Design a protein around this nucleic acid. Structure first.
Lengths: 255, 255
DNA sequence: CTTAATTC
DNA sequence: GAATTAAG
DNA sequence: CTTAATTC
DNA sequence: GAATTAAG
């Protein structure tokens, strides 16, 4: 029952995360950038009602907050099915174009897996839930990601923005990967015999024996929870000689 | 009056040419070729009446002759203007594909002109009329170029073919250029001080003085006429310090 | 909905 | 260069 | 007229 | 991939 032994480490029981050791992120703009305010494309009531629950949850969680910003990008009504479930998707392309580029340090899955020794056959795969939202944004950079939100009948002031690293921002994957690497540096040092692969929010822990993988997993979950990250108990693959990681099926040491 | 001094050398007074020193040409087929007989696309009366005079002239000249051949390619009604003058154009692409390739020995105009010394300022440009028709085709190769010709009211048997190198055949330019080079080899040897440029049917004779260009031109015209070639008196540019050759304007030694 | 590419 | 894909 | 390429 | 060019 890994779920009961580590309440804080799982999204299911530890609540929304927040990387407490990471300083709020400051997002540098390119040298010539000036704010861009793109009007919000009219949204149907169906889309608005579909998105509303999500916006309210984020406001309650403090991930979204009201604001007045010279920046504004549009929200899009996205429903994977034909017209089923919705979810807000922000078009941050005009913001991305004005943000200074950073070196892409996230390794491609192929190269990352090359660092997996044949000696480590016991695997544990964890995926961090709402990973980007665990990283705070400095108040100075929050206005950059503002969007409009209203209600034809008693709606918020006007704009809302993110207080955490947002989805759709070009540097989120890299910034998150780099932050988690800093937070897990000690863990690696304290567990020299363990192999830990990180691909943004997807983690692979490899060990030589089931026992080591057990103790190692316990230590990783404890560490992750303490740092403020949250893993999916639902999708978790604990101490298995066969696991699915980054589209690959790890078995017998193949792939 | 160069026209009167060399009756045989001009198309205007010497009649259709025939390169008497050149053996009738044999056209080798590719190793796997078999005859192809392409049906003649129906031709309107307007097109037929327009082409008729040309066919009759060629038959009278012996350039076209009746035949029965397993080969057949279509004739096309071509009228440069909107619907004015006509002229028969044969689509020999299927024949070209079955004929063995030869090395392209005709130099491009740019490289050909590089062999024109600044010392030779006096130019004479001649263009041979119906040049390809001056070269005979061996009877064994004549059937390759057959086409259909009839008259809704008393028409020739069925097919006609060429007894001379035809227009539209992929190797005609190269074969003609090579044949003329063989026929003018002696002339070059007999006139070491003269510069002679050959580009298929377009000739440029260059000399150091007007006198040399005069005597040289007289000798070239006499030689051409004797060999059976015919130049255009109409377009002839004799002993000029400025002439148009291959799209270029030769003047002061420029171009 | 808008848009940088990639196809047909 | 009017559609098709892929994406934010 | 049919066709190998090249554009839009 | 439906037009545009170029050609035999």
């Amino acid at each position: 029952t890994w779920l009961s032994d580590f309440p804080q480490a799982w999204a299911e029981t530890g609540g929304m995360g927040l990387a407490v050791r990471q300083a709020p992120l400051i997002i540098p703009l390119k040298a010539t950038s000036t704010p861009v305010s793109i009007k919000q494309y009219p949204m149907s009531q169906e889309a608005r009602l579909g998105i509303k629950p999500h916006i309210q949850r984020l406001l309650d969680q403090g991930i979204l907050v009201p604001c007045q910003s010279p920046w504004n990008t549009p929200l899009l009504p996205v429903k994977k099915p034909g017209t089923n479930d919705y979810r807000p998707v922000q078009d941050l392309r005009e913001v991305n174009k004005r943000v200074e580029d950073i070196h892409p340090t996230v390794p491609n899955p192929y190269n990352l897996l090359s660092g997996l020794p044949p000696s480590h056959q016991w695997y544990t795969v964890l995926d961090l839930k709402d990973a980007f939202f665990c990283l705070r944004l400095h108040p100075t950079s929050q206005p950059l990601f503002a969007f409009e939100w209203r209600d034809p009948e008693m709606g918020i002031s006007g704009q809302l923005t993110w207080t955490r690293l947002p989805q759709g921002f070009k540097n989120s994957p890299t910034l998150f990967d780099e932050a988690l690497h800093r937070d897990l540096a000690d863990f690696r040092i304290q567990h020299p015999d363990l192999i830990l692969l990180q691909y943004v929010d997807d983690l692979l822990l490899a060990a030589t024996s089931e026992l080591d993988c057990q103790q190692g997993t316990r230590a990783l979950l404890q560490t992750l929870g303490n740092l403020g990250y949250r893993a999916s108990a639902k999708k978790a693959q604990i101490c298995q000689k066969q696991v699915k990681y980054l589209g690959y099926l790890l078995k017998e040491g193949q792939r």
